[PDB]
């Protein structure tokens, strides 16, 4: 009881009828008492001649005093009283609650506008944490309520606390909760909901210095006090699902589970150290009876594998990861698709996995359900070709791709043809060849040959597709004149006998179709003026042109779409269009000017019995079979011996091509030379 320091303050604080103390005087006195009790040392101090104020600083007349100042100083004085006397704990539970219920009022006022006493309030919250005198609130018959109130004060939106106390607030709420074993679910919501209600990088502005207390606090507790929050996180997730399931509403469980997943997703992006607390639940969700939950669980893990994190998932939670990829055989196709729909992002976000993916995708490309196979081929469409050759490298993958080209399913077949097509084009204008990647090229080089084989199954639809596709990726109409032949050879490089026969056949028809469109216009210009409405060939030519238009419309899926197309063109009778069209079939035409007349021809038909749109998509795919593309000026490029020796895999092609181009009929060939002599 005897020390070196002693309380110097010895003035009345309680105002009675006999002896009263004005507000100001009492305010100043409490100020002195406060400033002194703060300098007093815990150990070396009398403390004996202080009890007088111990029983005075609890008078309800002061705790609920009008003037905020008195209550402020009183709270500061009490904070030190608990400090000094500690651990003796002088005040009883009753008196203690009245004090902790007053301090909360201070924290509440600390958020509101300055009452001219924030300094004292700041000292309160700070000292109450430094001396750990705030934990005393944890061991009370009303700690639960005081806890909920404590959090509501800081997490109160209508409040505005300085970024300076953020670290302090996290300490208060941190130590106070670290004393609880079963924190009210109400408190948990308030703490976790911040990860959902507040999401940064949402509004691209100038500084984003806005910041938020509730959020930062949640992070402090989930980071600094993760060891104690993880235990509660499991309770929260478990309690929520529990509450929503028993809920009279049968359409709430699925709505709440989706949020929890989003919460976990956010937690993993901020504090992936707590995900281990509820990682177990998810694990079983995947193999849960209800597929919906399995679908959501699969989608969740799929989103986590695409979010930035200081920690690794497949490394930390490998048990669940294997369960994730194990959904490639899930009974529910929806779960399968939901899975395959995440691969694109993952592959474009990480390269960590290149084994499980190739093993799963291999089965996904041959799954019974068409939906998944479609979502599988979509990969080569969404994710860039580059990332494709880098990540996936499985043999079955490519093979299965080109395999679906001959599949009965249309929607899948169509998408496939187009995909594996553009893929081939981009697989040559970006990725090169090495001593290791060439192991799979034998599949990408056989693509052009494959497409041409589709002409054998004989199908108006397929044929049209192939035609439009080839001249869209494989053999383009740009950019120069040399590179065309260069690639034209790289395309015909890996070609089987059927590929060539069909290749040449597709050309042998071009000269015939050309002889048609040519006359088509010669018979179309029939109405350029009165000629033989019933004179010359009127009764025969009419049925000549009318029966010739069906010829070029017999190789089209919708013949009734062509006969009406060219028929309306006959109605227009515009010499212009007739010129371009005719100037695109007269054979022997500079590839350059061809692209000019063609491009302008299809563009002039746009936005003019039905929309001309059809006429365009019909005449276009009709010209690819008519107009000469490969059998033109390209002859000179190949005519010029680009090789003096070696590279025999090119000379044989030069032969294969020219040898056939000459077989067309030298009927006109051996004539030019004669006129030249």
Secondary structure string (H, E, C) spanning 392-420: CCCHHHHHHHHHHHHCCCHHHHHHHHHHH
DSSP state of 477: S
Q: Is residue 175 part of a domain?
A: no
Q: Which residues contact 360 (CB under 8 A, 6 or more apart)?
A: 325, 328
Which residue in this structure is represented by tokens 């750990």? 132
CB atoms within 10 A of CB 186: 12
Do both 387 and 500 map to the same domain?
yes
Nearest C-alpha neighbor of 172 from the set 216, 132, 215: 132
Contact between residue 556 and residue 622 where contact means Cβ atoms under 8 Å apart: yes
Nearest C-alpha neighbor of 376 from the set 389, 351, 358: 358
Do both 465 and 555 map to the same domain?
no
Contact between residue 277 and residue 239 where contact means Cβ atoms under 8 Å apart: no
Nearest C-alpha neighbor of 573 from the set 616, 630, 525: 525
Do both 487 and 520 map to the same domain?
no
Q: Is the dihedral of CA 97, 98, 103, 107 positive or negative?
A: positive
Do both 524 and 475 map to the same domain?
no
Q: Is residue 637 part of a domain?
A: no
Nearest C-alpha neighbor of 216 from the set 177, 270, 268, 290: 270
Which residue in this structure is represented by tokens 């300490």? 171
Domain boundary residue among 442, 476, 504? 504
CB atoms within 10 A of CB 464: 21
Tokens matching residue 283:
């694990």
Do both 567 and 467 map to the same domain?
no
DSSP string spanning 306-317? TS--SS-HHHHS
Distance of CA 521 to the CA centre of its chain: 53
Contact between residue 70 and residue 23 where contact means Cβ atoms under 8 Å apart: yes
For 555, the domain range is: 510-623
DSSP state of 368: S
Contact between residue 363 and residue 403 where contact means Cβ atoms under 8 Å apart: no
Tokens matching residue 6:
């002693």
Do both 483 and 536 map to the same domain?
no
State whether residue 146 is helix, strand or coil: helix
How large is the C-alpha radius of gyration of the chain?
Answer: 42
Q: Which residues contact 136 (CB under 8 A, 6 or more apart)?
A: 82, 89, 96, 100
Contact between residue 380 and residue 342 where contact means Cβ atoms under 8 Å apart: no
Which residue in this structure is represented by tokens 């309690």? 239
Q: Is residue 285 part of a domain?
A: no
**Cα dist. 247→18, 243, 252, 297, 594 in Å?**
62, 6, 7, 21, 71
Domain count, the chain: 3
**Cα dist. 400→331, 380, 598 in Å?**
22, 13, 37
Contact between residue 485 and residue 504 where contact means Cβ atoms under 8 Å apart: no
- CA atoms within 13 A of residue 136's CA, in its CB half-sphere: 29
Phi and psi at residue 276, in whole multiples of 5°? -65, -15
| 87 CB burial (10 A radius; 0-12, 13-18, 19+) | exposed
Phi and psi at residue 600, in whole multiples of 5°? -75, -25
Phi and psi at residue 348, in whole multiples of 5°? -90, 0
Element (H, E) at 534: none
Tokens matching residue 568:
């309306």
Distance of CA 335 to the CA centre of its chain: 18
Residue 87 preceded by cis peptide, ω within 30: yes
CB atoms within 10 A of CB 208: 11
Q: Please give the Cα distance from 372 to 34 (Å, whole number).
A: 73
Do both 498 and 376 map to the same domain?
yes
Nearest C-alpha neighbor of 178 from the set 212, 210, 216, 138: 138
| 482 CB burial (10 A radius; 0-12, 13-18, 19+) | exposed
Nearest C-alpha neighbor of 651 from the set 493, 503, 481: 493
Q: Please give the Cα distance from 286 to 326 (Å, whole number).
A: 9
Q: Which residues contact 489 (CB under 8 A, 6 or more apart)?
A: 650, 653
Phi and psi at residue 404, in whole multiples of 5°? -65, -5
**Cα dist. 646→493, 495, 641, 652 in Å?**
16, 20, 12, 11
Q: Which residues contact 396 (CB under 8 A, 6 or more apart)?
A: 362, 365, 366
Do both 590 and 604 map to the same domain?
yes
- CA atoms within 13 A of residue 259's CA, in its CB half-sphere: 16
Q: Please give the Cα distance from 673 to 677 (Å, whole number).
A: 6
Q: Please give the Cα distance from 623 to 599 (Å, whole number).
A: 12
Q: Please give the Cα distance from 197 to 300 (Å, whole number).
A: 19
Nearest C-alpha neighbor of 482 from the set 625, 584, 633, 293: 633
Q: How far apart are the first and last CA of the chain?
A: 134
Q: Which residues contact 447 (CB under 8 A, 6 or more apart)?
A: 402, 420, 421, 423, 424
Domain boundary residue among 603, 623, 643? 623
Element (H, E) at 176: helix 166-177
Q: Please give the Cα distance from 385 to 401 (Å, whole number).
A: 14
Q: Please give the Cα distance from 76 to 68 (Å, whole number).
A: 12
Contact between residue 340 and residue 302 where contact means Cβ atoms under 8 Å apart: no
Do both 110 and 46 map to the same domain?
yes
Which residue in this structure is represented by tokens 């109450």? 128
Chain breaks in the chain (C to N over 2.5 A) after: 608
**Cα dist. 454→207, 312, 458, 499, 534 in Å?**
58, 46, 7, 10, 46
Residue 403 preceded by cis peptide, ω within 30: no
Alpha helices in 271-394 (DSSP H): 279-286, 291-304, 313-316, 318-324, 333-340, 343-347, 356-364, 370-377, 379-382, 385-390
DSSP state of 626: T
Q: Which residues contact 230 (CB under 8 A, 6 or more apart)?
A: 273, 274, 276, 277
Q: Is residue 668 part of a domain?
A: no
Element (H, E) at 145: helix 143-154
State whether residue 462 is helix, strand or coil: helix
Do both 385 and 410 map to the same domain?
yes
Q: Please give the Cα distance from 263 to 259 (Å, whole number).
A: 6
Counting every residue written for the chain, the total comes to 677
Q: Please give the Cα distance from 367 to 396 (Å, whole number).
A: 13
Q: Is residue 651 part of a domain?
A: no
Q: Please give the Cα distance from 622 to 559 (Å, whole number).
A: 12
Dihedral (Cα; 299, 305, 307, 308), 10-degree rounding: 160
Do both 493 and 574 map to the same domain?
no
Q: Is residue 529 part of a domain?
A: yes
CB atoms within 10 A of CB 124: 24
Contact between residue 13 and residue 57 where contact means Cβ atoms under 8 Å apart: yes
Q: Please give the Cα distance from 373 to 328 (Å, whole number).
A: 12
Nearest C-alpha neighbor of 451 from the set 414, 426, 410, 477: 414
Render the burial of 519-549: b for 16+ CB within 10 Å, e for the rest. Answer: ebbebbebeeeeeeeeeeeeeeeeeebeeeb
Phi and psi at residue 190, in whole multiples of 5°? -50, -40
Q: Please give the Cα distance from 614 to 629 (Å, whole number).
A: 23
Q: Is residue 661 part of a domain?
A: no
Do both 111 and 130 map to the same domain?
yes
Q: Resolution in A, one decimal?
A: 5.8
Q: Please give the Cα distance from 46 to 301 (Å, whole number).
A: 62
Element (H, E) at 166: helix 166-177
Contact between residue 437 and residue 431 where contact means Cβ atoms under 8 Å apart: yes
Q: Please give the Cα distance from 98 to 581 (Å, whole number).
A: 95
**Cα dist. 215→23, 179, 200, 385 in Å?**
40, 22, 10, 40
| 456 CB burial (10 A radius; 0-12, 13-18, 19+) | exposed
Domain boundary residue among 451, 477, 504? 504
DSSP string spanning 18-49? SS---HHHHHHHHHHHHHHHHHS-SSS---GG
Q: Is the dihedral of CA 323, 324, 329, 330 positive or negative?
A: positive
Dihedral (Cα; 154, 196, 266, 380), 10-degree rounding: -160
Nearest C-alpha neighbor of 31 from the set 11, 6, 55: 11
Q: Please give the Cα distance from 286 to 295 (Å, whole number).
A: 7
DSSP string spanning 232-257? HHHHHHHHHHHHHHHSS-TTSHHHHH
Contact between residue 174 and residue 217 where contact means Cβ atoms under 8 Å apart: no
Dihedral (Cα; 291, 294, 296, 301), 10-degree rounding: -160
**Cα dist. 533→242, 367, 527, 538 in Å?**
87, 63, 9, 5
Q: Please give the Cα distance from 154 to 125 (Å, whole number).
A: 12
Q: Please give the Cα distance from 183 to 234 (Å, whole number).
A: 12
Q: Is the dihedral of CA 312, 315, 320, 324 positive or negative?
A: positive
Tokens matching residue 500:
């060539």
Q: Is residue 71 part of a domain?
A: yes
Render the burial of 1-25: b for 16+ CB within 10 Å, e for the rest. Answer: eeeeeebebeeebebeeeeeeeeee
Q: Please give the Cα distance from 140 to 93 (Å, whole number).
A: 6
């Amino acid at each position: 009881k005897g020390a070196v320091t002693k309380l110097k303050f010895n003035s009345p604080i309680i105002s009675t009828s006999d002896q009263l103390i004005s507000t100001n005087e009492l305010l100043d006195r409490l100020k002195a008492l406060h400033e002194e009790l703060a300098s007093l040392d815990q150990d070396n101090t009398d403390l004996t001649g202080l009890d007088k104020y111990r029983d005075a600083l609890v008078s309800r007349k002061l705790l609920k005093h009008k003037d905020v100042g008195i209550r402020a100083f009183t709270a500061c004085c009490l904070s030190d009283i608990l400090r000094l006397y500690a651990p003796d704990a002088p005040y009883t539970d009753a008196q203690l609650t009245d004090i902790f219920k007053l301090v909360l009022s201070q924290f509440e006022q600390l958020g509101d506008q300055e009452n001219g006493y924030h300094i004292q309030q700041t000292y309160l919250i700070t000292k109450l944490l430094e001396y750990r005198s705030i934990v005393l609130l944890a061991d009370l018959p009303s700690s639960n309520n005081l806890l909920i109130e404590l959090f509501h004060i800081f997490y109160d939106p209508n409040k505005s606390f300085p970024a300076r106390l953020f670290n302090v607030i996290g300490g208060i709420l941190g130590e106070v909760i670290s004393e609880f074993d079963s924190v009210p679910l109400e408190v948990l919501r308030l703490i976790f909901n911040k990860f959902l209600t507040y999401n940064p990088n949402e509004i691209p502005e100038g500084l984003n210095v806005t910041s938020d207390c509730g959020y930062e606090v949640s992070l402090i507790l989930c980071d600094t006090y993760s060891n104690r929050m993880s235990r509660h996180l499991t309770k929260y997730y478990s309690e929520i699902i529990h509450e929503a399931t028993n809920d009279d509403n049968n359409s709430r469980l699925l709505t709440v589970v989706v949020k929890l997943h989003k919460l976990v997703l956010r937690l993993w992006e901020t504090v992936p150290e707590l995900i281990n607390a509820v990682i177990g639940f998810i694990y079983h969700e995947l193999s849960s009876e209800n597929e919906l939950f399995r679908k959501e669980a699969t989608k969740l893990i799929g989103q986590i594998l695409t979010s930035y994190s200081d920690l690794n998932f497949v490394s930390t939670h490998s048990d669940t990861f294997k369960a994730w990829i194990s959904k490639i055989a899930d009974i529910s196709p929806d779960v399968r698709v939901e899975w395959t729909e995440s691969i694109p992002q993952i592959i474009a976000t990480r390269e960590d996995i290149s084994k499980e993916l190739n093993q799963a995708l291999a089965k996904t490309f041959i799954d019974s359900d068409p939906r998944v196979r479609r979502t599988s081929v979509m990969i080569f469409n969404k994710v860039p070709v580059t990332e494709i050759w880098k990540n996936i490298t499985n043999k079955a993958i490519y093979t299965s791709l080109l395999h679906l080209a001959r599949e009965k399913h249309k929607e899948v077949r169509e998408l496939c043809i187009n995909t594996m097509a553009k893929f081939y084009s981009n697989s040559l204008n970006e990725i090169e060849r090495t001593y290791q990647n060439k192991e799979i090229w034998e599949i990408i080089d056989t693509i052009p040959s494959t497409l041409y084989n589709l002409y054998y199954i004989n199908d108006l639809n397929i044929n049209e597709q192939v035609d439009s596709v080839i001249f869209e990726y494989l053999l383009p109409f740009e950019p120069d004149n040399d590179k065309r032949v260069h690639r034209l050879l790289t395309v015909l490089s890996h070609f089987d006998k059927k590929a060539f026969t069909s290749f040449f056949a597709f050309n042998a028809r071009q000269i015939k179709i050309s002889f048609a469109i040519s006359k088509y216009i010669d018979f179309s210009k029939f109405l350029n003026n009165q000629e033989s409405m019933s004179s010359s060939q009127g009764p025969i030519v009419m049925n000549k042109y009318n029966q010739t238009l069906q010829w070029l419309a017999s190789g089209l899926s919708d013949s009734t779409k062509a006969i009406d197309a060219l028929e309306t063109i006959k109605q227009f009778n515009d010499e212009r269009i007739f010129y371009l069209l005719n100037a695109c079939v007269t054979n022997d035409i500079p590839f350059l000017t061809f692209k000019n007349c063609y491009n302008e021809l299809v563009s002039k038909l746009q936005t003019p019995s039905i929309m001309p749109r059809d006429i365009a998509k019909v005449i276009q795919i009709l010209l690819f079979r008519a107009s000469p593309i490969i059998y033109n000026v390209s002859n000179i490029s190949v005519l010029l011996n680009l090789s003096n020796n070696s590279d025999a895999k090119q000379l044989d092609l030069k032969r294969r091509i020219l040898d056939d181009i000459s077989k067309v009929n030298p009927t006109l060939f051996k004539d030019q030379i004669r006129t030249l002599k």
